[PDB]
DNA sequence: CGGGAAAATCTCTAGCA
DNA sequence: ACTGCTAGAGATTTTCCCG
DNA sequence: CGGGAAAATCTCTAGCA
DNA sequence: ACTGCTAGAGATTTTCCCG
C-alpha cells in the first residue's frame, strides 16, 4: 500500500497520511477520512 | 489506390511530447491515426503517442515549398 | 545498528534531523536513516519536483476570465493551435459565459472546454449550454491554475498586446478586438512558423482529412496478424516492423515473428 | 525531377492545373506552376457579405462567407455604424477577411465602419445573402422554443447552420467547407511567397545565358531557359541574385 | 526590399507584428524585419532571460525580516556557509536592528551586510552601528528580493522548521531558537555534507589559515617573471603553466614563453 | 551607443529608451532624463 | 604506505601524536591513530561557564567558552530561570555546547533551565569566570560613554573582547581561537566516526587469521595483525563484516 | 620549507561558479589566494575566480578519512 | 571483464511574500 | 556602480563488490 | 574539405494573479 | 479519476555558400 501526504486547496498545511486510490501523470486520487480528493503530483508525496 | 492514401497519410507532420518531457519533439511522420493514439515515425523509430499529446499538421509552407 | 537506530529516532523526535545528519551522527546506513525520516508524519512537507502536461487534443478549449480597467474579459484558446477569442462581458456570470460559449460552439468545432472553478463556469446555465452544444466540461483541480496554464498564459499575451494598442481605440472592447486580431493573424511562431489563425485552420483541416483517409485505408486494407498470439488487427507495416492492435492495445513488433494473413 | 516531361505532356493533353501535376508526378509546386503558366491556351476566400435583417423587432447583423456558405450572425441592439464596426472588427480578428460586400445602408457606409475597415485592411465594395437570411430565419423559427431570448436562438441557429446541416457535393457542413477553403488559400499564398522569393535570382549553367530559377533542391537545380525547363546538377550551375 | 520595408513599417504601426510575421508577409530578410521591431519603442517589453549571482564571500551576511503569528523575526545568514541567526524582535525598527547587528558583529567576523531597503535597515542608527563595527552596508536594487535570495530562501527554511517544532515550545521566541538550533546543527547537506554550523567553522578557519600560509609563501617565494613583457610577479608555477600578476591582472600563461627570474 | 528599455520599482510599465552607463552581470546602470537608475538585467533590454 | 615503519620509529623515539605522524609521513589518520594507540607508554571544546553579574543595577548573563576565552554576554531584565533558559538555548543553537558549568544559583538550577538542557542535549555540572567578568567590566567601562544604554555597551565590550583584543602565544583573538578549537573538534569527531565505521570488519590476507581493518585505499588494504600493521594488496585480501 | 606550505595550500578544496552558470562546480584544488581572486586547478585546468564566487573549505571529513 | 546494488550526481520544484 | 536561492524527491549515471 | 555568415535550435525568463 | 504554458532574448550548434 501507499501513504500519501498532500497539500490541497490553498491551505499551506501538509496533511496525510491518506490512502492512494489512483495515480496518473501530474495528479493523484487519494482518500483521507472517507473524503476522496484529487491532488496534483506537484502537491503530493507518495510513500 | 491504397499506396496513394498511405503516402498521403505519411505526408502529415506530428509534433508530440513524451509523458515526462516538456519540450515538444520535432516534426515526425504520421503512420496511423486512432481515436486515442497516433502512430508516428520519428527519426527511424516508430512510437505510439496518446492523442492528447500530439499536434498533427500539414505544414503548408513546407508542402508548397516542396 | 540497534543502538544507533534507537538513538536516532529519539533525537529525530526533538529535532527532525534529516537523513544525512542521522547517518553522520549515528553511523547508520542511508536506507535506515531515510527510513526514520519516511516514517515521520512531521517531515512530509515537499511535493515531487515535476510538472504534468495538459491535454492538447484538437477539440479542447481552455477558458478563463481576466480583468482590465475594471472590466471583465472572457478569453478562450484552442489549445492545439494557440488561437484565441475574447470578449468584454458586462458581468462574470453564467449567462454571459453560456452565451459566449454558444457563439464559440457555433463558429468552431468545440468538443471539450476546460476551466477553473469560477462560479460563472460551474453555473447551471453553462451546463445547459454545453449539454445543448455537445460540449464536454472539464474543471481543473481547484486552485491549480497550471491545469489551464495555456489559457492563463494567453491572458498574459492578450493583456500585453492590449497595452501595445490601447491608444488606437477609445473603448476597451475595441482594443480587445484589435488585440485578438493581432494575436491570431499578425504574430508568427510556434510549430509551423504559423500565425495562430493559420495554425488552427491547418489543425482542423488535417484532422478532417486524416480522418477521411485513414477511414478509407481501414476500409480497403483488411488483414489479420499473428505474432509470437491471437488474430491482431494490422494498422501499419513497413521498414521491418509491424504495428498491430491486439485487444485495444497498440504495440510495435518487428517484422520477424509476425505473419500477416 | 525525371517526370517533368511526363507532366508537360499531361498538361498539353488535359490542361491539368498545377495541383494535379504536382500531386501525381511528384514535382515541387513551383515547377508545376511554371508548366501551367507556360501555356497560353490553358488560361474568393476573403470575400464576406454583410446585411442587417429584422426579427421580432430586433436587429440581426449577418455575415456570410460567400465561397463557403458559413455564417457569423448576432443580435445587435441598434443598427448603427459603431455596432457594425465592432462586429466587423470581431470577424476580422477571427477569420481572414479581405473584402466586405454591403448594401449601402446607413450603417455600412458610416465613418466608423470605414475606420474599422482601414484598420483591419478590409476593402469595402458597395443574392446569396437574401436566401441565406431566409434559411437562418427558418432555423431560428425551428429553435425559437428552445430558448427564452432571441439572441440565444440566433446563436443556436448559427450552430445548426454551420455544423448540423450538410449538403452539396460531398455532404460537408459549411464549417468544414470554410476550413477547407481557407486552408487552400494559405497554400496558395505560401506558393506565391515562394515564387516571389525566388523570382529575383539568375542562374548560369554549364557558361550559358541567364536562366530563371524555379527550385534549389538538395541534389539538383531546376531552371527555365527559352521556355524550356532543364534540370542541371548543383555543382554545374551558379546562382546569383539580381 | 524598399517596397516591402515601407509596407512592413506601416503595418507594424497598426499591429506591432513580430519579426517572423513581417518576414513572412513582406518577403523580408530576418535582420531587416527584426530591425523594424528593434526600432519600435512599443515593442520593447521583455527582459533578458538570465539570472545574476550573489556575492558569496566569507564576510558577507544577508539580513531580512519575516513575520509569523503577528510577530517580527529578524534573520541573518552567512552566505558562504548557510549558517543562520534569528531573534524575535518587538518591532521592525532600526533600534532592534542595530542592536541585533552589534551582537552578530561581536560573535562572528561580519564584514558586509546586504539587505533589502526596509526602513529598519536604512535607518540612521543601523548606519551608526555598522560604522562602529566596521560593517560595510549593501542595499539591493529596490523591489528585487532575488538580490538577497539567500536570506529570502532561509526565511522559507526557518519557517518550515518552526512549523515542525512549534508545539514543543509555548512562545514563538523559543520555537525560533529551537529552529535555529535545528537548521545549524541537525541538518546536513551542501558542499561538505556539513551542517551549516560545521561549514561556517570550516569557512572561517580556512580563511584564516590560507591567509596565513599564502602570506608566508609570498614572504619566501619572491621572483620576477617575463612572458611574451614587464617584470610580472610570480604567483604559482607547475604542470607546464605559470600564473603571474601583471599590473593587478592575473593571467595563466604556459611554461613556454615565460622565464622566471 | 545603446538604448536601454527597462522596468523598475514595481511598475509593470516598460520605459525607455535610456542611456546605458554601465553593464555588470545581473544589473545595469542607466540614465533616463538625468535620473540614474540601477536595474537588474532580468528587467532590462539593451539595444 | 611505505612510511609506516618510519612513523613507528618516530613514535618510539619522540612519542609524537597522530597529527604529526600523519602530517609528516603522509598516512591516513586512522593508521597514525592506531600507531599512537598501540603503545602503552605514550598514554573541552563543548564546555561553557555561565554566570550572572551585576552592573548599574542591571543583570548581565555571561557565557565563557573555557578553552577559548570567547564570551557571549547580554543584559537580561530579570535573573530568572526562563531568561537563563532562553539565553542557553540561543547559545546552543549558535555554538556546539555540550556542558555548562554554573554556580548553583536560583536561575541556573530551575526546572526551565533543566528542560532547555535536556532539549538541547546539554549536561549541567554544578575561576576563569571571575577574572573574565572583571575583564568584561573593564571594557564596558572603557566604552560606556560610546552608547546611551548599558545593553549596547555590553555588546560593544563583547565585540572588543572577542575580536579587538589579541594575546597569548600566537597573538590571536578569542574568536579566531574558538574557531580553531571547534574546527579541531570537528576533525576529531570525523576521525572517531571513521574509526567506529571501520571497526566492525574483519580481514583475511594471503588465508591467515582475522586481522583488524584500518584503511581501504585504492591500491592497498592496510590491516593490523598481532599488534603489527601490514600493508597487503587489495586483490590478495578479503574483507568481511562481523 | 616552501614545499610544505604549498602542499598545504593545495589541500584546500574550492567550490566555485562561472559568471553565468548557476550550478556550483565540484571541488577544485586551491593554488593561490588573493584579495579578489583565487587561482584553482579544476580537472587539469587552471582557472582564475573572483573571490565573491568561491567557497574554500578543508572538507574535514575527507581529510580525516584520508 | 559483468551484473547488482549502492552511492553519487543531476534535474527540477515551492516559497521566500 | 550588481546580480536568486535552498533543500528535498526522484531519476540517472558512476562506483564498487564479489565472482 | 574550410571558414564566415546565416539560419536553426536550445536555454531560460515573467506573467498569467 | 489529471496534469503549466507562451513567446521573446540571447547563446549555441547546424547549414549553407563560394572557394
Ligand atoms: C518594505 C520592505 C522593503 C521593500 O519591499 C517590501 C516588500 N517585500 C517583498 C518580498 C517578496 O516579495 N518575497 C518573494 C520573493 C520573490 C522572488 C524571490 F526571488 C525571492 C522572494 F523572497 C520580501 O521578501 C521582502 O522582505 C519585502 C520587504 O521587506 N519590503
Ligand atoms: C474564483 C476563481 C476560481 C478559483 O480561484 C480564484 C483565484 N484565481 C487565481 C489565478 C492565479 O493565481 N494565476 C497565477 C498563476 C500561477 C501559476 C500558474 F501556473 C498560472 C497562473 F495563471 C488565476 O489565474 C485565476 O483565473 C483565478 C480565478 O478565476 N479564481
Ligand atoms: Mg479564472
Ligand atoms: Mg486566470
Ligand atoms: Mg524584507
Ligand atoms: Mg524577505
Ligand atoms: Zn520528522
Ligand atoms: Zn512595435
Author numbering:
A (entry chain D), F (entry chain J): 222 to 268
B (entry chain C), H (entry chain I): 212 to 277
C (entry chain A), E (entry chain G): 1 to 228, 236 to 268
D (entry chain B), G (entry chain H): 2 to 44, 57 to 139, 149 to 228, 235 to 270
Show passages lifted from the paper.
HIV-1 and other retroviruses integrate a DNA copy of their viral RNA genome into the genome of the host cell, a process that is mediated by the virally encoded enzyme integrase (IN). Because integration is an essential step in viral replication, intasomes are targeted by an important class of antiretroviral drugs, the IN strand transfer inhibitors (INSTIs).
To compare the distinct systems used to examine how INSTIs bind to intasomes, we next compared the structure of the E138K/G140S/Q148H HIV-1 intasome with DTG bound to the structure of G140S/Q148H SIVrcm intasome with BIC bound, which was solved previously. This causes the Nε2 atom of H114 to approach closer to the Nδ1 atom of H148 by 1.0 Å in the HIV-1 intasome. The compensatory effect appears to be caused by S140 forming hydrogen bonds with both H148 and T115, which creates a favorable energetic environment around the active site when the mutation Q148H is present in conjunction with G140S.
